[PDB]
C-alpha cells in the first residue's frame, strides 16, 4: 500500500498534536481530585472511569501521524505500568512536558542530539538524587503503614501484608485468593513462580486483571519446541475428557501450535494456556525438572524419546491453581510429593556444596530458594460478594505497593520528591548551550505532576508550586484536605521505584521523539 512520508517540522507538529490529545485525555485523572472520563462502549451506558490506563487504552485518532504520536506515548506509559505497577498517568504527564519543551527548543533551532544528551544527563543525576532521598521501608511497621495507606487507610490489609511477608520473607511469593468466611486466612503451600508470559493475550480469561487463571489444571511439560499440533492432539483429548484446564510449559510453541490452541480456547473446548519454558541451556532443563518434581509430573523430553503424542494423563502433573500474568506465571499448591521436593532441594544444595564458580552457586541457590520457599495464599474475608471483590482488589493493590516499597524504599508523594530533586540539581551543566537547555527542560518538566495535581484540585498551580519549592524536606501540599504539611506525616507516600521508572521511561520516549526526523505511514485512503 502506498505510503505517505513527512519530514522534519511537519512530522514533529503532527506528533506534538497527537501527544497533546492523548495527554489531555489522560492527565485529568491524576491525583485524588481527578476528574471523570466518559468512554463509549458498543452498547448500553458508557463507562465512567478515573483510571488513566483505561482512558489511554481507548485513545487513538483518525490522523495517521497523530496516531503515531499517541501510540508512541502509550507504549512507554504501558512500559512504566509493567515495571512498577503504578504511575502511568505520572509518566504520561512527564513525557508530555518533556516532549513539548524539547520540540519547542528544536523548532527554535537547537541540535536535537545535544538536547537528548542534556535530558539524559539531567535524568541520570535526578535518579541519583532520588535514590539518595529515599528512606528504607523494610521495617514491619513500615510494611503495615504502606499497606494501610495503599488500601485507603485500612488496618486489616496492612496486617495481612505484613504477616505474609514475615511468614514467607520479603522476597517470597504472595498470591491473593478469595476466602470462604468473613475471617481472613493466610497460609503457605508448595509452589513457586517463574518469569514467563503467555504467548498470546487470547488465553486471558480475566480481562479486568489481564491474567490467565486456571483452577486445578493439568500441566504438560515438554523439553522440545512444540509444533505440529497433530502431535498435541491426544493429550488434549485426554485432558478435555477429564474436564480440566491445561498449562503447557514448552521450550517454544511455534506457529500453528499456539493459533490452534487459541482457536480451541475461544471456541470453548479445552482451557489450555501455553507458556515458554523458563531459563535456557542446561538451566532450562534443570528448572524444568524442578517444576516436574514440584508438580509431581514427568518431563516429556524428546531427546530420550517420550514421543509427545504418546503422553498420558499420568505424565502430566497437577496443581491447585496457576496464574499467568503479563511476565510471570505462578504455580500454587502443586500435587507433587513433599518427599520428592525435599529430595530435590537436598540434591540442589549438594550441587551447591561442590559448586566451583560464583555463578553456579548463585544459580543453584536461586533454585533452592524457589523450591523451598513456597507461595503465601491470602484468603480475603468478608460478608458478601461486593465486599469480597473490593477487599481482594484493595489487598492486591496494597501488595503491589508494598512490594515496590520493599524493593526501593519510599519518598514523599504528590510530586514533592521530584520537585526536591529538581531543586537539588539547579547547578548541573552540559558541554554546550543546547545541553544546558535540555537540562533545564528536564528540570522544568520535573515539576509537572504536582502542578497537574493542583490544577485538578482547583487551586492555582504556580502559587502552590512556588510555596512547595520554598519549603524543604517533606513539606508538601495535600490535595485531599487542601492544606500544607509534612507529606510523610500525613501518609502521602510513593515508592521510589514508581517515580524512578516514570521519569526514566518518560525521558526515553521524549528523546526518541525529539531525535525523530522522518515518519512513514499508510495513505489516508
Amino acid at each position: 500500500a502506498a505510503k505517505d512520508v513527512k519530514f522534519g517540522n511537519d512530522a514533529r507538529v503532527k506528533m506534538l498534536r497527537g501527544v497533546n490529545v492523548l495527554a489531555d485525555a489522560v492527565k485529568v485523572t491524576l491525583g485524588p481530585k481527578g476528574r471523570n472520563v466518559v468512554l463509549d462502549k458498543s452498547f448500553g451506558a458508557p463507562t465512567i472511569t478515573k483510571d488513566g490506563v483505561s482512558v489511554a487504552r481507548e485513545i487513538e485518532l483518525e490522523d495517521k501521524f497523530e496516531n503515531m504520536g499517541a501510540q508512541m506515548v502509550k507504549e512507554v506509559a504501558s512500559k512504566a505500568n509493567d515495571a512498577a505497577g503504578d504511575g502511568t498517568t505520572t509518566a504520561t504527564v512527564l513525557a508530555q512536558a518533556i516532549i513539548t519543551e524539547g520540540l519547542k527548543a528544536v523548532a527554535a533551532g537547537m541540535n536535537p542530539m545535544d538536547l537528548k544528551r542534556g535530558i539524559d544527563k539531567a535524568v541520570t543525576a535526578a535518579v541519583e538524587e532520588l535514590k539518595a532521598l529515599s528512606v528504607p521501608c523494610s521495617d514491619s511497621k513500615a510494611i503495615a503503614q504502606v499497606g494501610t495507606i495503599s488500601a485507603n487507610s485500612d488496618e486489616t490489609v496492612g496486617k495481612l501484608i505484613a504477616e505474609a511477608m514475615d511468614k514467607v520473607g520479603k522476597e517470597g511469593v504472595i498470591t491473593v485468593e478469595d476466602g470462604t468466611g468473613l475471617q481472613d486466612e493466610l497460609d503457605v503451600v508448595e509452589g513457586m513462580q517463574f518469569d514467563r508470559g503467555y504467548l498470546s493475550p487470547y488465553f486471558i480469561n480475566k480481562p479486568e486483571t489481564g491474567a490467565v487463571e486456571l483452577e486445578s489444571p493439568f500441566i504438560l511439560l515438554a523439553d522440545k519446541k512444540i509444533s505440529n499440533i497433530r502431535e498435541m492432539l491426544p493429550v488434549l483429548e485426554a485432558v478435555a475428557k477429564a474436564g480440566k484446564p491445561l498449562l503447557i510449559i514448552a521450550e517454544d510453541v511455534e506457529g500453528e501450535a499456539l493459533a490452534t490452541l487459541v482457536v480451541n480456547t475461544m471456541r470453548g473446548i479445552v482451557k489450555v494456556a501455553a507458556v515458554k519454558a523458563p531459563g535456557f541451556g542446561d538451566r532450562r532443563k534443570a528448572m524444568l525438572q524442578d517444576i516436574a518434581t514440584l508438580t509431581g509430573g514427568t518431563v516429556i523430553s524428546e531427546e530420550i524419546g517420550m514421543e509427545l503424542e504418546k503422553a498420558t494423563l499420568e505424565d502430566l502433573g497437577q496443581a491447585k491453581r496457576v496464574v499467568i500474568n503479563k511476565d510471570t506465571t505462578t504455580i500454587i499448591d502443586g500435587v507433587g510429593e513433599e518427599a520428592a521436593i525435599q529430595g530435590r532441594v537436598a540434591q540442589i544444595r549438594q550441587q551447591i556444596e561442590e559448586a566451583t564458580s560464583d555463578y553456579d552457586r548463585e544459580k543453584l541457590q536461586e533454585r533452592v530458594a524457589k523450591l523451598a520457599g513456597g507461595v503465601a495464599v491470602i484468603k480475603v474475608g468478608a460478608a458478601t460478594e461486593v465486599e469480597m471483590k473490593e477487599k481482594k482488589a484493595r489487598v492486591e493493590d496494597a501488595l503491589h505497593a508494598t512490594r515496590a516499597a520493599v524493593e526501593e524504599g519510599v519518598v514523599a508523594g504528590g510530586g514533592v520528591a521530584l520537585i526536591r530533586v529538581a531543586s537539588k540539581l539547579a547547578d548541573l551543566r552540559g558541554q554546550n548551550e543546547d545541553q544546558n537547555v535540555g537540562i533545564k527542560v528536564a528540570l522544568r518538566a520535573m515539576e509537572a505532576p504536582l502542578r497537574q495535581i493542583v490544577l485538578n484540585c482547583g487551586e492555582e498551580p504556580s502559587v502552590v508550586a512556588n510555596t512547595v519549592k520554598g519549603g524543604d524536606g517533606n513539606y508538601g501540599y495535600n490535595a485531599a484536605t487542601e492544606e500544607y504539611g509534612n507529606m510523610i506525616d500525613m501518609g502521602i507516600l510513593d515508592p521510589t521505584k514508581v517515580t524512578r521508572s516514570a521519569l526514566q521511561y518518560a525521558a526515553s520516549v521524549a528523546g526518541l521523539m525529539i531525535t525523530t526526523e522522518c515518519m512513514v505511514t499508510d495513505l489516508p485512503k
Partner: peptide, 12 residues
Amino acid sequence: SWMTTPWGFHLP
C-alpha cells in the same frame, strides 16, 4: 476446511 474430531477439536 477445518477438520473436526469426534470429540469436537476444530483442527485448522
